Design a protein around this ligand. Structure first.
Ligand code: SAH
Ligand code: K7R
Length: 274
């Protein structure tokens, strides 16, 4: 199928997002960029961190199999290079919705300039304590001026499509979202099935972004911006560095169906206050 159209477009989205806030970090900390990749998966963003020229990376995921794949991909990157430097990394298996990551870090008092949480944080909204815990994990160890960036389904788009659907499901040939019931969107535990054909079929939880925003305040976070994937793309392609990067990473235009899948998402970035 066309899995890698969406995969690579989404990776271009993450690269533009990561690149933007790495540049904002580097405008101050050219010294020792430290990044928490929360829900790193199998390490899809390792290369972006390598190109970002960061110094330390904590890769953590709930799936141990994915963390070890992340570790292996990292060691493969490290084991050969045109380059001479590459960030150091630690790899932590953990439910960042239930466990304190500082309990696992090599260095507990370490601080991050960026916590990147790409397509992960909505799993934290099973419950308030889990949503709070993931925020704490993403944000508590952020240095003042550090960034909490991520991508997560846009609850408005999900709900809008749900209310517009004649059923509790919606989607196309590429993806299906099924809510358990309609009109019942609890702050937490609002579960729905997300099926991305050939990619993932996993239950997710509605993240009402104003709720995520309010909750980030508890960790001295302020929203830098929230952008739908449409807003973000339409804005970011205007910069032709981003455009060319999309031509190099992408496999061609997204299909209407792919864009329908991708458009459920939003990009967000918060900054740790002084
Ligand atoms: N509670 C939790 N804590 C840590 N990671 C979680 C999690 N719930 C889900 N995940 C992870 O979130 C990831 C979602 S897929 C996104 C992976 C990666 N960030 C990327 O952009 O490619 C998966 O790897 C999954 O294992
Ligand atoms: O583009 C991405 C990142 C990506 C794409 C292909 S592999 C990583 N997205 C959007 C759709 C779902 C992805 C997702 N969520 N949960 C997952 N679990 C397992 C595997 C994938 C998972 C996140």
């Amino acid at each position: 199928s066309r899995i890698f159209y969406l995969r690579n477009f989404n990776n271009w989205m993450k690269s533009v997002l990561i690149g933007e806030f790495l540049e904002k970090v580097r405008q101050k900390k050219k010294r020792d960029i430290t990044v928490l990749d929360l829900g790193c998966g199998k390490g899809g963003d390792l290369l972006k961190w390598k190109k970002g020229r960061i110094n330390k990376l904590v890769c953590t995921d709930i799936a141990d199999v994915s963390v070890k794949q992340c570790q292996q991909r990292y060691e493969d990157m490290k084991n050969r290079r045109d380059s001479e430097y590459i960030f150091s990394a630690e790899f932590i298996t953990a439910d960042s919705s239930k466990e304190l990551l500082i309990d696992k870090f090599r260095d507990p008092q370490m601080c991050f300039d960026i916590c990147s949480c790409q397509f992960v944080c909505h799993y934290s909204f099973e419950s308030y304590e889990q949503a709070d815990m993931m925020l704490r994990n993403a944000c508590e160890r952020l240095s003042p001026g550090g960034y909490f960036i991520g991508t997560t389904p846009n609850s408005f788009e999900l709900i809008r499509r749900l209310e517009a659907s004649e059923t509790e499901s919606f989607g196309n040939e590429i993806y299906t979202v099924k809510f358990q019931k309609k009109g019942d969107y609890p702050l937490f535990g609002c579960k729905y099935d997300f099926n991305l054909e050939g990619v993932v079929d996993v239950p997710e939880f509605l993240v009402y972004f104003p709720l995520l925003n309010e909750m980030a305040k508890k960790y001295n976070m302020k929203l830098v911006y929230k952008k739908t994937f449409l807003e973000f793309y339409e804005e970011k392609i205007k910069n032709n560095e981003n455009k060319m990067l999309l031509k190099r990473m992408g496999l061609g235009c997204l299909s209407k169906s792919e864009w329908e899948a991708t458009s459920i998402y939003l990009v967000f970035a918060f900054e740790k206050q002084q």
